[PDB]
Design a protein around this ligand. Structure first.
Ligand SMILES: Nc1nc2c(ncn2[C@@H]2O[C@H](COP(=O)(O)OP(=O)(O)OP(=O)(O)O)[C@@H](O)[C@H]2O)c(=O)[nH]1
Ligand SMILES: Nc1ncnc2c1ncn2[C@@H]1O[C@H](COP(=O)(O)OP(=O)(O)CP(=O)(O)O)[C@@H](O)[C@H]1O
Ligand SMILES: Nc1nc2c(ncn2[C@@H]2O[C@H](COP(=O)(O)OP(=O)(O)O)[C@@H](O)[C@H]2O)c(=O)[nH]1
Ligand SMILES: CCC(=O)Nc1ccc(C)cc1O
Ligand SMILES: [Ca+2]
Ligand SMILES: [Ca+2]
Ligand SMILES: [Ca+2]
Ligand SMILES: [Mg+2]
Ligand SMILES: [Mg+2]
Ligand SMILES: [Mg+2]
Lengths: 438, 425, 352, 54
């Protein structure tokens, strides 16, 4: 058994972290007070769920997690929420004034004064691990903390835990649920400084999650609660292999091996199906073929883009529920004969398939319906570069006029870090094109 | 705990400041004696932003009343909510400022500023985490203009990394007390360009025209003009004073509204604006159409003459948040020529469930528009019409000022006009 | 009020559509870089499809199908036909073609020579034509040594296909010609064929014993108007429209344009567009596509129709700009953005 | 269409299907960037105070 430490940075990271640990508990049978009746080993054990939970002598199963925010309002919900009992105070770190959506403020001005405190708390969790695999870092691209402080944390983690893997769950900025105008700056600044420190990053575009909520869940104006409960389902589907018995994606290292043959291109596309409304009278349960075929519909991708016009480098299918290998292979054959799935010539044309018999758990009273089988497909498509292009174009529009640059320069950042970060993105976009286009 | 420190200076500043605390105190359920009597927890969620909590569950505004003569502040102390203010927070002299910027900034005002800073420092030392300051004042007089901007200069020196916000009443010859108001306003504007993060520009002519033409008030009074300022000040601070998914503090607002440090002068607006047909329900389209109408704008500047750098709209009341997005996108997607295309998604909307007193719903408009250069052009023209003949300068040179300082104020604002002009094309 | 942007100033077609759109008083043109648009009349090359459909509350529409280049590129069309089972390598309406890369750079050099040597040995007509997309650069020859050596002198991909040695000739004149069909595919992937076609005829008598002079062999409107001496002799602008051409087929061949030619044309159009539908369809896409296509066909003396190429950014005949451009606004633009017949198109029903 | 590496357990199984074969900064340097930016802030504020001193 090897432990994984989860780090939630900024509002988006913390609120998403809250929704995942709520789900993790419902999946593992852990109650809000930390007890786990099915855990026959009291105050110890090296089971699969122990990769995410330590155990006290009193039988409490405590998340291996750290929550960090430069302002306390969001983390205070954790301290007084339903699962307040899961964590102890050392795990929740709050400052007193945030980064004002200013990358430079989170990375430099404020980050410099709190980084050693966060590293000390993470070190405490690390000392409880007999074989730490690495870290899962949840953050937004847009926030000043999620962008500026996260990149600072990733740089130090690479120094303090050189041989440890680091995965990201990053929230891509979408105007429908944002009042900030500078988020292209922050996103591109944090991608530049984090790129060499992240082994694998799962980008979720709020625009995609927003449209899935309005389309499949019939939510006219989704809230962060609606968005986060759906996001934590995809996150859970991705981390289940680490928390349950299995043989695929059993440790963080396997995510890079199976999904990232080229280091810089480490942003897999996630696609999830089915998402059915709970308020629905009663839905017809979809088959293995129908949910697998849905993995190649843009409508259920965590980032809107057209995989038909890119090249695949890897492809995992993570099933949960009533699924047997026979059915999966039948659907795959049917899809290849109907879909446009172009692999890069230097990669095998195939699919790694993982099946977990336990169907997706849904939060009681939540928006999602209980289904008998679900799948999350992780595919490394060059088509996700459309997201970088969109973001780099918005950056170019404002930076040409140096709009808002003074806010960053005023917090000690050099203007030349903008162009240095931007040129890195232009090189990232060129890598994708060299790999995907003829 | 993101506390704001309020300062009101001079006649205009204290009279507009007074009504402001009167309007929001009613919104937060605080009575004239400081006791809460509302019926919703939303009234107290962010109550500490503007109020200090005293013994016995009393709420005392975090405001400092400043003037160089006693009169207006004796009025406040005897006004409706006069008893609600901290007695030690009244700081005033006896000389007056005679509508003289040099008296408020260099002579009379300099003698009193240190004691005002002692009270400011007192209110700050008790804030768990101070967001920043807001000042209400006019630019055409002497105390709010000259001493107000002196206060700002010294507050920025002692709190260099706090946000400094002002509600600045701009003089107009149609609603004028003395002919020297362009002098005082030109001198103050440069101080604001240097030492404020956000300045809400309130033109007394726009206030007058609205009272006369829209509200149908035959003979507007300063009281009528102050009702508009009250409601507008309540509107722009709704996000700060009530809970919502925005979670915005002064520095976050500034960061998304000010793309260039000197261009931080805002056009505020308010809707509805109805004469006494006053009980009619106002639909979201109507609300949105008016909010973007120039006749609902208080800078007396035609937005169609410039371009919006950033826009912030706050809707108050129980309404269709889905229906708001549609009409907001409709205004943008029907007049996109007046928005700079080099700032993606520069029009933001925020909702609030609690409506102002006596209205099912309302909308407050906050625009960073290059059209505001028209306001500074008027002032500059009126300044030059007198300064070219050195008319009325003896009032100022008698206080130790030199003509050179006036020539520089003149140039400083014509530079500001030019900076707005380059971003308009 | 709907908004659109113009990013292809050289498009005579959409220059008219933009003109018509503004004439409705319900469409407003924006600067070519304004993202808040309903309709993009985009550029030909490197159109940024990835930036479409990400503006909240705007239904966005573009006049190009992403991925249609596979059909409108010389080499791409050949590869698409030979690799797609829907068309197969035994496709009977497309001339035997081969993709040939210049030796200074897969490639079908040896496969071409195998079929060539077979034709030369069997006394059959062995005349081929070499062309590419980078042309205004065409060569017609019966010797395989001349065709290949011509491609090596270039630096771009070329295609060698069978030259139709028995083309149908119009009388009087004894002259070659080609047929241009305009096809409009809307966002729902309905295939509409403009009822009005055009024949680009050669004003010179077809001479089979001299492919060196390419004035009677190439029916391009620009070649006839520059190197031919009988331009505009038989019909105005070397352009014969369907009404005249149909009357000729009846007096000369005792058949109609519908029976003898149009059925094959409508069949070829369906087969090509249906083939690539799953690859380019925007049914479940965050934005919507439509595109105007210009198909070029050949007719041999057996009244069999052959496909020459497909044009993704075609032009229209001067006399047909008004009717066609209006039709574009009706079925492709107003169908998505309605305003406050006897359709000029022939809907080619099919299974999606 | 080949299935390889079938692994079965009580809570699921996994396998690999193949349809076709193929064809940092030290801790010293991070503090320098954090202190260099803090130096540019101190310098800018020093100029602001110098300005207010004049
Ligand atoms: N999906 C999702 N997105 C969120 C959530 N909270 C914030 N965001 C997005 O994150 C971006 C804003 O950054 P935040 O995370 O709120 O800011 P921060 O990381 O706390 O840093 P500060 O600027 O210091 O407040 C916007 O694009 C929001 O849409 C959330 O709970 N769920
Ligand atoms: N295989 C073939 N057999 C006989 N003639 C052919 C031929 N391929 C091309 N042609 C002649 O060439 C002309 C079309 O050439 P092609 O279409 O390849 O060039 P092009 O694409 O630059 C013209 P456009 O795109 O405007 O239709 C036709 O008029 C036809 O007569
Ligand atoms: N809107 C408004 N403007 C005022 C009020 N009182 C004065 N003014 C304006 O303020 C300017 C005079 O400044 P004033 O505040 O009287 O001078 P001060 O007391 O020395 O600061 C003139 O332009 C007046 O029109 C008021 O109550 N409301
Ligand atoms: C700037 C205008 C001004 O100074 N006005 C003025 C007039 C009379 C007296 C006594 C004092 C005064 O201040
Ligand atoms: Ca145990
Ligand atoms: Ca590393
Ligand atoms: Ca004195
Ligand atoms: Mg935050
Ligand atoms: Mg006065
Ligand atoms: Mg062509």
């Amino acid at each position: 058994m090897r432990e994984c430490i989860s780090i939630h940075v900024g509002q988006a990271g913390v609120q998403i972290g809250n929704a995942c640990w709520e789900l993790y508990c419902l999946e593992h049978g852990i109650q809000p007070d930390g007890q786990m009746p099915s855990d026959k080993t009291i105050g110890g054990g090296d089971d699969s769920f122990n990769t995410f939970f330590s155990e006290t002598g009193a039988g409490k199963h405590v998340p291996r997690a750290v929550f960090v925010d430069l302002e306390p309002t969001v983390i205070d919900e954790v301290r007084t929420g339903t699962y307040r009992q899961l964590f102890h105070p050392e795990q929740l770190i709050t400052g007193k004034e945030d980064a004002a959506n200013n990358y430079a403020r989170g990375h430099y001005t404020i980050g410099k004064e709190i980084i050693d405190l966060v590293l000390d708390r993470i070190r405490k969790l690390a000392d409880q691990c007999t074989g730490l695999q690495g870290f899962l870092v949840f953050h937004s691209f847009g926030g000043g903390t999620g962008s500026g402080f996260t990149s600072l944390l990733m740089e130090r983690l690479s120094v303090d835990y050189g041989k440890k893997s680091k995965l990201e769950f990053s929230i891509y900025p979408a105007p429908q649920v944002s009042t900030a105008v500078v988020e292209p700056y922050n996103s591109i600044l944090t991608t530049h400084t984090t790129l060499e420190h992240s082994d694998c990053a799962f980008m979720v575009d709020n625009e995609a999650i927003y449209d899935i909520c309005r389309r499949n869940l019939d939510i006219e104006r989704p809230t962060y609660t609606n968005l986060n409960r759906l996001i934590s389902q995809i996150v859970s589907s991705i981390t289940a292999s680490l928390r349950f018995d299995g043989a695929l994606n059993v440790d963080l290292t396997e995510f890079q091996t199976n999904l990232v043959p080229y280091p810089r291109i480490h942003f897999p596309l996630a696609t999830y199906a089915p998402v059915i409304s709970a308020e629905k009278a009663y839905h017809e349960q979809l088959s293995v073929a129908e949910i697998t075929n849905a993995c190649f519909e843009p409508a259920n991708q965590m980032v809107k883009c057209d995989p038909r016009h890119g090249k695949y480098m890897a492809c995992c299918l993570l099933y949960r529920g009533d699924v047997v290998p026979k059915d999966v292979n039948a659907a795959i054959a049917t899809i290849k004969t109907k879909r446009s799935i172009q692999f890069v010539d230097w990669c095998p044309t195939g699919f790694k398939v993982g099946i977990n018999y336990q169907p997706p758990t849904v939060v009681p009273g939540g928006d999602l319906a209980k289904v008998q089988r679900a799948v999350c497909m992780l595919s490394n498509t060059t088509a996700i570069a459309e997201a970088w292009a969109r973001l780099d174009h918005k950056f170019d529009l404002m930076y040409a006029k140096r709009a808002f640059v003074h806010w960053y320069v005023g917090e000690g950042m050099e203007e030349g870090e903008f162009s240095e970060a931007r040129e890195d993105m232009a090189a990232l976009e060129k890598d994708y094109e060299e790999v995907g286009v003829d | 705990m993101r506390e704001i420190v309020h300062i009101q200076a001079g006649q205009c500043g204290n009279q507009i400041g007074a009504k402001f605390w009167e309007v929001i105190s009613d919104e937060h359920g605080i009575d004239p004696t400081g006791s809460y009597h509302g019926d919703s927890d939303l009234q107290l969620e962010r109550i500490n932003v503007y109020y200090n909590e005293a013994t016995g569950n009393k709420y005392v505004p975090r405001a400092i009343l400043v003037d160089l003569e006693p009169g207006t502040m004796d009025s406040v102390r005897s006004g409706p909510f006069g008893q609600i203010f901290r007695p030690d927070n009244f700081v005033f002299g006896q000389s007056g400022a005679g509508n003289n910027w040099a008296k408020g900034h260099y002579t009379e005002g300099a003698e009193l500023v240190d004691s005002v800073l002692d009270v400011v420092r007192k209110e700050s030392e008790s804030c768990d985490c101070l967001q920043g300051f807001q000042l209400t004042h006019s630019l055409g007089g002497g105390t709010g203009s000259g001493m107000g901007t002196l206060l700002i200069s010294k507050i920025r020196e002692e709190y260099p990394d706090r946000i400094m916000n002002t509600f600045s009443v701009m003089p107009s010859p149609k609603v004028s007390d003395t002919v020297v108001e362009p002098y005082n306003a030109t001198l103050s504007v440069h101080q604001l360009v240097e030492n404020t993060d956000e300045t809400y520009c309130i033109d007394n002519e726009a206030l007058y025209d609205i009272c006369f033409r829209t509200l149908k008030l035959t003979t507007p009074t300063y009281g009528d003009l102050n009702h508009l300022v009250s409601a507008t000040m309540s509107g722009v601070t709704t996000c700060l004073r009530f809970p919502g998914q925005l979670n915005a503090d002064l520095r976050k607002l500034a960061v998304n509204m000010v793309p260039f440090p000197r261009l931080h002068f805002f056009m505020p607006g308010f809707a509805p604006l109805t004469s006494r047909q006053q009980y009619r329900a106002l639909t979201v389209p109507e609300l949105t159409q008016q909010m973007f109408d120039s006749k609902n704008m208080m800078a007396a500047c035609d937005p169609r003459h410039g371009r919006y750098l950033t826009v912030a709209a706050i809707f108050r009341g129980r309404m269709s948040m889905k229906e708001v997005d549609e009409q907001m996108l409709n205004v943008q997607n029907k007049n996109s020529s007046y928005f700079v295309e080099w700032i993606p998604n520069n029009v933001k909307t925020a909702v609030c469930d609690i409506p102002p007193r006596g209205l099912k719903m309302s909308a407050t408009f906050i625009g960073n528009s290059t059209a505001i250069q028209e306001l500074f052009k008027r002032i500059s023209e009126q300044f030059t019409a007198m300064f070219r003949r050195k008319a009325f300068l003896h009032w100022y040179t008698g206080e130790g000022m030199d003509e050179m300082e006036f020539t520089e104020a003149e140039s400083n604002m014509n530079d500001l006009v030019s900076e707005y002009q380059q971003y308009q094309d | 009020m709907y908004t659109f942007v113009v990013r292809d100033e050289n498009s005579s077609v959409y220059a008219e559509v933009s003109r018509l759109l503004l004439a409705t008083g319900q469409w407003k043109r924006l600067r070519k870089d304004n993202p808040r648009f309903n309709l993009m009349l985009g550029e030909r090359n490197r159109l940024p499809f990835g930036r479409l459909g990400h503006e909240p509350g705007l239904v966005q529409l573009v006049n190009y199908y992403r991925g249609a280049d596979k059909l409108c590129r010389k080499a791409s069309l050949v590869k698409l036909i030979k690799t797609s089972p829907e068309l197969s390598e035994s496709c009977t309406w497309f001339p035997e073609s081969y993709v040939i890369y210049p030796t200074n750079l897969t490639d079908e050099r040896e496969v071409f020579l195998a079929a060539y040597n077979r034709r030369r040995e069997g006394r059959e007509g062995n005349v081929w034509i070499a062309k590419s997309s980078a042309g205004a650069g065409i060569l017609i020859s019966s010797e395989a040594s001349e065709l290949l050596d011509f491609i090596d002198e270039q630096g771009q991909v070329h295609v060698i296909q069978k030259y139709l040695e028995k083309p149908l000739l119009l009388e009087p004149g004894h002259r070659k010609f080609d047929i241009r069909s305009w096809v409009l595919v809307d966002h729902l992937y309905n295939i509409y064929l403009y009822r009005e076609g055009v024949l680009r005829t050669s004003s010179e008598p077809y001479n089979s014993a001299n492919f060196q002079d390419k004035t009677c062999h190439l029916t391009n409107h620009c070649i006839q108007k520059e190197y031919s001496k009988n331009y505009g002799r038989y019909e105005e602008g070397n352009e014969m429209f369907f009404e005249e051409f149909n009357q000729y087929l009846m007096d000369a061949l005792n058949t109609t344009l519908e029976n003898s030619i149009l059925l094959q044309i409508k069949h070829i159009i369906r087969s090509c567009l249906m083939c690539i539908e799953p690859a380019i369809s925007t049914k479940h896409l965050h934005y919507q596509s439509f595109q105007l296509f210009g198909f070029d066909f050949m007719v041999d003396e057996e009244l069999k129709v052959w496909l020459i190429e497909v044009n993704g950014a075609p032009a229209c005949a001067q006399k047909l700009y008004a009717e066609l451009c209006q039709g574009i606004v009706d079925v492709a633009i107003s169908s998505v953005f309605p305003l406050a017949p006897t359709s000029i198109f022939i809907k080619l029903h099919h299974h999606h | 269409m080949e299935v390889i590496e079938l692994n079965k357990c009580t809570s699921g199984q996994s396998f690999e299907v193949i349809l076709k074969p193929p064809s940092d900064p030290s801790l010293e340097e991070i503090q320098k960037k954090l202190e260099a930016a803090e130096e540019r802030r101190k310098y800018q504020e020093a100029e602001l105070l110098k300005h207010l001193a004049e």
